[PDB]
Amino acid sequence: ESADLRALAKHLYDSYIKSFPLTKAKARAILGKTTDKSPFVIYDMNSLMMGEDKIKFKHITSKEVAIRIFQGCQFRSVEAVQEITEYAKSIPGFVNLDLNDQVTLLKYGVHEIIYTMLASLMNKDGVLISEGQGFMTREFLKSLRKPFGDFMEPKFEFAVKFNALELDDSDLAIFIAVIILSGDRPGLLNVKPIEDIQDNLLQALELQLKLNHPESSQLFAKLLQKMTDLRQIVTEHVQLLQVIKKTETHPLLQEIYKD
Amino acid sequence: ESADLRALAKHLYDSYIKSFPLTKAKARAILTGKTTDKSPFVIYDMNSLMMGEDKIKFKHITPLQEQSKEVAIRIFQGCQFRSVEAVQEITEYAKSIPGFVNLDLNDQVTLLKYGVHEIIYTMLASLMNKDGVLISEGQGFMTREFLKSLRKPFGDFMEPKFEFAVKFNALELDDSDLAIFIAVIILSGDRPGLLNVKPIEDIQDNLLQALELQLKLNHPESSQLFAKLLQKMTDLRQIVTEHVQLLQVIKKTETDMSLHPLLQEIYKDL
């Protein structure tokens, strides 16, 4: 009954809160009033350099600033992937799946989930970095050299539209689960169970959206159609990655942050 | 009330039958073996193609020297004007979508500019099965294999269409479903360049409501089909792009073959 879907909804939520440090609620308060610890604003080359100094960076140390930002973005991408992999393991039924299938789903669902949540740390003027301690302005990012100047923009554009839906953490938890249980990933050895689980997640999400957003007409449908926006954001990111790789192309560091 | 939603479904289904000669119902009866219709002539090779001309009448593109005005090109020019026809048909359909003609002239053109092809492959599926596709109103049937064996660049145009058609057809949707779905596709508020997005989103929202009702009523047992169908809109975007790159390869592999102006204009695309 309803209960069953809510139980699953509460579960994914609590699981989402444990797996992810910076939630959308927290990020919003930061982006948002809660004035008494405003983030360090990076909008300048000097801002950046004071920032790397003042604020905390576990990924670095004459090498373009542009190239050191893009790399950073990647380093952070790899952290999120572990957070996501742990959360996926809490989705009822995910572990019982063929181990290879689990790997393929994660392998293809990671970018989509990464960008969905990035929107939670974004607004039309910038993004939260250093897991909330900072805020890199959109203008500063768009301001980087040729290939690197337009690498976050497509993401900011998606964020503005996705955020229009005004979803919250409890909404997003079920949503990212649906994305992981995608039966159309290439190489899947057994689609039925995956598809059988996404179906159950889709009902939980639909009910969750309806109880959580009575007035928000057909929100379920609008969210599901934003899933194309992501696919395009993903296809489009691997393309710049192509370009770049014909700019830049440590050996041990390259192995950890492969794709 | 849902009564307003059913009326809307009934209305769109009606305009759909009126705007599209070859429906899915007719397409299937011809493909499966029903007496309600006749058998198609099958084009599975170079010679069936030859024989295809007499029997099957298209006039579109019939002979132009040996396979030199290449069977490939000839088939392509044909598939071009068929596309042009579909566009006109989808255009006529769109005019009946409540509210669509009441929008800014600029947006109407932009909605069709981007919705047309997504609709063409959605509907083209009804004319396909893992083995081939109906051509010339269903009079003919061209094999997936004949089509994949063409000149280096043209043997790649239809495959991702078949690829999509097989999974999409797995949904077992009928004409009453597609009419509302096709409507939704057109009323896409996120199209690039839309001056007014709001009037459009309010119309799609109602259509989404109509489609949502339609599915659960027409497909009682097919769980979450509504979400399953919406997610299909993704495979559609990839069909389009995938194809634009090919049109770009064509535009210069063959500088002697012409592209229909209509199709050309709709192409400063996505």
From Swiss-Prot, chain A:
Phosphorylated in basal conditions and dephosphorylated when treated with the ligand. May be dephosphorylated by PPP5C. Ubiquitinated by E3 ubiquitin-protein ligase complex containing FBXO9; leading to proteasomal degradation. Ubiquitinated at Lys-18 by TRIM55 leading to proteasomal degradation. Ubiquitinated by E3 ubiquitin-protein ligase STUB1/CHIP; leading to proteasomal degradation. Rosiglitazone binds at residues 74-77, 111, 237, 257. Keywords: Activator, Biological rhythms, Cytoplasm, Diabetes mellitus, Disease variant, DNA-binding, Glycoprotein, Isopeptide bond, Metal-binding, Nucleus, Obesity, Phosphoprotein, Receptor, Transcription, Transcription regulation, Ubl conjugation, Zinc, Zinc-finger. A motif (9aaTAD) lies at residues 251-259. It is linked to Defects in PPARG can lead to type 2 insulin-resistant diabetes and hyptertension. PPARG mutations may be associated with colon cancer. Obesity: A condition characterized by an increase of body weight beyond the limitation of skeletal and physical requirements, as the result of excessive accumulation of body fat. Belongs to the nuclear hormone receptor family. NR1 subfamily. This is Peroxisome proliferator-activated receptor gamma. The chain holds residues 235 to 503 of 505 of the full protein.
